[PDB]
């Protein structure tokens, strides 16, 4: 879940459970050359790779062997008619084996 507040943990505190997930992910054809078992995903920047591992394993029942994630910087060179820089939204690319 993104854009939400998570409970602070103290010693002996309850296990963290997300009953409804706001994370939305997109499977993308590999831009680079990757092994066939490897799968690329565009995921929210606040998601952890463990969350993706749990996300795929639980919601989609997909077995995962390895995960590699990268952050792609969004170009801010573009400017509008007023000469105000336009920033491409940064996205996280996750390589899941």
């Amino acid at each position: 879940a993104r854009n939400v507040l998570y409970p602070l943990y103290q010693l002996g505190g309850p296990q963290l459970r997300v009953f409804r997930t706001n994370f939305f992910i997109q499977l993308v054809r590999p831009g680079t050359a990757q092994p066939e078992d490897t799968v690329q995903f565009r995921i929210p920047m606040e998601m952890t790779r463990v969350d993706l591992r749990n996300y795929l394993e639980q919601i989609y029942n997909v077995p995962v062997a390895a995960v590699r994630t990268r952050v792609q910087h969004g170009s801010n060179r573009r400017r509008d008619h007023k000469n105000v820089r336009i920033k491409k939204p940064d996205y996280k690319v996750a390589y899941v084996q």
Partner: protein, 96 residues
Amino acid sequence: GIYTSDRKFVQIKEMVPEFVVPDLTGFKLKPYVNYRAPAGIDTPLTAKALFQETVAPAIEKDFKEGTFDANNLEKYGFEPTQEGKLFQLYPKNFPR
């Protein structure tokens, strides 16, 4: 997780969320609804409506029977505190 001394990460299992996934097998509710399906008149649930639907019948029956007292208000559903529940309405202590 928490980073200990020497800047070494130590994952806290409690702080790592566990995705509770509902069982969608046999569930008739789907991404879309037919254009055939007529819309229902919106009746949002409120504290008064929830009290009327759930709490009012119990108190009404007890009041007529005479078995109503201030000590047993929690019996009708009052929670003096939200502590102890996995989901606390206030302060909110659970993720969506």
